[model samples]
Target: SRMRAVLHLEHKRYFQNHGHILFEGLAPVSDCKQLEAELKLFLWRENVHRTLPGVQMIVKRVRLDHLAAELTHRSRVALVRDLWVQKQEEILFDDCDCSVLLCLSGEKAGWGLFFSGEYPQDVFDWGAGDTAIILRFSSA
Candidate 1:
């Protein structure tokens, strides 16, 4: 929940950064992990609203190329398929809320946020060399 709240706040601040929050504070690149931790705390605090019940959210940071390789590996097909089916079922019932932050490497140094409603399309469009932190929430 704290992570979710932090996400919402970050999202708000992100928009504000383009225009309004002129006085917002800034830190060096070394502090990035600390900032992420703070955001996770904030999101947990914000989850008290219980917009959905029995929801479980998981955040995972993974490399795009690695993921691609793993998915394409014949030996991993069964595992991947199981996970995909589970995700699909959750989304179909509107019992899932997920968000992913894509981190593109090389010339790019930024993150992109995506929610549940943008699934298959997002999966298809994801590029190689990009990393991502996936946040998935499910309600049974």
Candidate 2:
């Protein structure tokens, strides 16, 4: 058990220092569990808020059961049968000089696409310049 504890500490250190990613617009205090939970935390980490000390990201998921299409890449998005209809939001950092767009209408459910651009289509940049972090949860 002590070995496990040490492993956990080293793992957290690695994840926070080298082997992982970080954010500044999310990082719950939201129901955004698992990584996104960490995500929500990273986003809110450096942000200032009420009695909570940071902002809480509110996420919503919509079901796309009646969908049909393909090759949507060129003109439209490929229809998804088991998708979340991917929603969108803006993490307005009223205090800082930057903000982020949160895209949820991904082809997969529970996946968030972030961006410093006009759209969450790319990982443009971060608050402290080009120092950006990418956190990948799934391997496929």
- Tens digit of lDDT per residue, candidate 1, span 1-140? 12111224554444344311111111122232333344445443233213322112122222322222232221221111101111222323222333333332222223333333334432322234332233333321
Stretches of candidate 1 above 4 Å error?
A: 1-95, 118-127, 138-140
Cα error, candidate 2, residue 27 (Å): 7.7
| lDDT, candidate 2, 8-100, per-residue tens | 344344433532222332322133234233434545322222222111223212111111001011122211111111122232322211122
Best by TM-score: 1
Quantify all predictions' global Cα lDDT against the true fold: 0.28, 0.24
Assess candidate 2 and give its lDDT.
0.24
What would the C-alpha RMSD of candidate 2 be, to one decimal place? 18.6
For model 2 the local lDDT of residue 87 reads 28
Error of 1 at 91 (Å): 13
The TM-score between candidate 2 and the true structure equals 0.19
